[PDB]
Design a protein around this nucleic acid. Structure first.
Lengths: 38, 136, 141, 131, 94, 106
RNA sequence: AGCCAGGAUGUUGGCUUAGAAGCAGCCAUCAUUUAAAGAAAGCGUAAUAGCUCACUGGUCGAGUCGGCCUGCGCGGAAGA
């Protein structure tokens, strides 16, 4: 998974969460869009 | 890269970048990328930021460049001790004061220009914003 | 009335029997034979004319052939023998390629009304004529 | 959605169609198709023109809002998805029976064809119309 | 709806001007005709939302000071160097 | 101007994979061609250059899961190809007068 | 905000006849039937088909959405 400094929503089904303080972008659609950090 | 066609002098003093900018109002286009940050845009950054903007709006639209370098910046060659004269002008820069309109654009939708100026801003070191030509 | 299964509105001039460069694999893409669009394709075509691209329903079943009700040619190609020029757009408002008149196009519009769906003819009129407007053609009202 | 002017506009427009209206019927296509749009509304074209309004907007504060000024008995028709069907040419025309027959003509459902108001009655299949 | 409440200034200069403009209010002035110029401070937010209409830079305004109403025009105006805010307005008397 | 072989390539694959074989079309220089169903089996008349045709057997072999089958024959010398018009040396030697031909070049 | 509904005939439209068929690029960006529907934002096709969103019904029943300005914080932040 990507761990970029910037984590904007790629697909439409991307959703921003902030688990354990660390911001993440979970995508229920495409597993490639899953990313951390930012 | 933008560069003066012949000048009175080849090298010039560093100088300070103090003060508010004069290019405050939008004067040509309907929009603009005003420079909030205090810096010194090099020629390569203007040509580069322009590319990543002239392409962003495709063949349509019209862009103005409100700044021009006209300040030669010298550099000392690597592994050379201090002294022995002023270095060699390696590149040209334009000093940028806060509130200094950089790029202007017309003939494009407000949102399209809104996206085009995000990319050119991405290319530029100084902090920027977005402005619109208010009638008087 | 069963929904979507295989019916597709695609074929060239109705005078071109058993096509392969135009349609070919497209009509015989399913289990239906290539022969089915020549022996049966002109069984209704001969009654009117030939050389006119007229769409027909192709609701394929497991019963070899299929049920169909032929419809109506597009206004676009109708505007060649009924427009003068065989061309069309490319330059819509950039130049006036051709022109007809509401007295003729409204006159042809109600002919296709067997396929068209409208509460009154006038509507179909401005509809089809506007279709003509898209071609760079401007109606001489 | 556009504000009060437009909602109220369409509603008062519906009220003007009751001023010169007559027989009406219900219809509830929870699973309708545009194919059926070209049956009852093509039938509208078979009657005269565009004027006929299925105006499916039975919000208790929308279509039922135009109810207190015209036909208050239709207030109980309000609940669930409902589309009122007014008429104008031919008093007590055949538009009513076409909902019952059309529903049996591949249309899933039709609000249990309870009908509306001419004798202030209820769900009643009636061929008893001026023919 | 062009009407703005605006008190009379007392301490003019770079000093009180900055204390004032850094208080959600900014200075301005009404001048024109034979009358001597009247220095007039007014609320920021309002006027900031007022320049959102072109009629603010053409149609006559009616600034209310000490009960007395002054019909005016926005002859001149100074934006902030870059921040979305005003700094000063020249209301030439109409 | 370069000219290359473009022999037709008929192929017979199961219809369920027949869409996937269409994906092979984009991956190959060969143009789409008329084809027809044959019971559960499906068939299509291809037409691709011999230079890339050799991998086509591997392609049908992979897409069909070994169920694939195909056949082809050379035809149509006309075709044209790119890019740079590369050519295979060389001619010629073992004959008199070639030195005069070398003289002609300069 | 979620919820089964709907989201059309020619448009195989002229285009360089190999296709561009709402969606490579063109320009046009029709108008009807209408509670609504862009001759279409995305996906998927050799191109279709197909799957979505715009939009609008109803179910539903009270506040909710998007910018601006700023305060203080999180990430970006790895060495013997």
């Amino acid at each position: 998974m990507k761990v970029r400094a910037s984590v904007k929503k790629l697909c439409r089904n991307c959703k921003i969460v902030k688990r354990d303080g660390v911001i993440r972008v979970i995508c229920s659609a495409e597993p490639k869009h899953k990313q951390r950090q930012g | 890269m933008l560069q003066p066609k012949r000048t009175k002098f080849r090298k010039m003093h560093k100088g300070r970048n103090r003060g508010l900018a004069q290019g405050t109002d939008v004067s040509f286009g309907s929009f603009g990328l005003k420079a909030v940050g205090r810096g010194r845009l090099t020629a390569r950054q203007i040509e580069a930021a322009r590319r990543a903007m002239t392409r962003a709006v495709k063949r349509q639209g019209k862009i103005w460049i409100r700044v021009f370098p006209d300040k030669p910046i010298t550099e000392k060659p690597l592994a050379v001790r201090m002294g022995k004269g002023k270095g060699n002008v390696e590149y040209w820069v334009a000093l940028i004061q806060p509130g200094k309109v950089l790029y202007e654009m017309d003939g494009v939708p407000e949102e399209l220009a809104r996206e085009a100026f995000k990319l050119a801003a991405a290319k530029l070191p100084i902090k920027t914003t977005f402005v619109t030509k208010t009638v008087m | 009335a069963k929904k979507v299964q295989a019916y597709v509105k695609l074929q060239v001039a109705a005078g071109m029997a058993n096509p392969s460069p135009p349609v070919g694999p497209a009509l015989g893409q399913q289990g239906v034979n290539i022969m089915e669009f020549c022996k049966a394709f002109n069984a209704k075509t001969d009654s009117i004319e030939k050389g006119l691209p007229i769409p027909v329903v192709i609701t394929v079943y497991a019963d070899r052939s299929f049920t169909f009700v032929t419809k109506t040619p597009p206004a676009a190609v109708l505007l060649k023998k009924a427009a003068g020029i065989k061309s069309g757009s490319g330059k819509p408002n950039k130049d006036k390629v051709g022109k007809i008149s509401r007295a003729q196009l409204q006159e042809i519009a109600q002919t296709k009304a067997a396929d068209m769906t409208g509460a009154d003819i006038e509507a179909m009129t401005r509809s089809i004529e506007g279709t003509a407007r898209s071609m760079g053609l401007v109606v001489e009202d | 959605m556009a504000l009060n002017l437009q909602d109220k506009q369409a509603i008062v427009a519906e009220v003007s169609e009751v001023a010169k209206g007559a027989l009406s019927a219900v219809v509830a296509d929870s699973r309708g198709v545009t194919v059926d749009k070209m049956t009852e509304l093509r039938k509208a074209g078979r009657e005269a023109g565009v004027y006929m309004r299925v105006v499916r907007n039975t919000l208790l504060r929308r279509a039922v809002e135009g109810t207190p000024f015209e036909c208050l008995k239709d207030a109980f028709v309000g609940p669930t998805l409902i589309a009122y069907s007014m008429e104008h040419p031919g008093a007590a025309a055949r538009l009513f029976k076409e909902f019952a027959k059309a529903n049996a003509k591949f249309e899933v459902k039709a609000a249990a064809f309870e009908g509306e108001l001419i004798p202030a009655s209820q769900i009643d299949r009636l061929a008893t119309l001026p023919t | 709806m062009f009407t703005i409440n605006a008190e009379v200034r007392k301490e003019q200069g770079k000093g009180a001007s900055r204390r004032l403009r850094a208080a959600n209010k900014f200075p301005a002035i009404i001048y024109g005709g034979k009358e001597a110029p009247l220095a007039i401070e007014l609320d920021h937010d309002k006027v900031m939302n007022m320049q959102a209409k072109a009629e603010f830079y053409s149609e006559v305004l009616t600034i209310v000071v000490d009960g007395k109403e002054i019909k005016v025009k926005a002859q001149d105006v100074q934006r902030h160097p870059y921040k979305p805010k005003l700094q000063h307005i020249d209301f030439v008397r109409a | 101007e370069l000219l290359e072989p473009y022999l037709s390539f008929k192929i017979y694959a199961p219809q369920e994979y027949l869409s996937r074989a269409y994906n092979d079309a984009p991956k190959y220089c060969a143009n789409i061609v008329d084809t027809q169903l044959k019971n559960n089996e499906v068939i299509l008349s291809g037409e691709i250059p011999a230079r890339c045709i050799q991998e086509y057997r591997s392609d049908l072999t992979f897409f069909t899961n070994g169920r694939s089958v195909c056949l082809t024959e050379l035809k149509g010398y006309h075709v044209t190809t790119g890019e740079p018009v590369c050519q295979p040396r060389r001619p010629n030697s073992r004959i008199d007068k070639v030195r005069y031909m070398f003289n002609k070049i300069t």
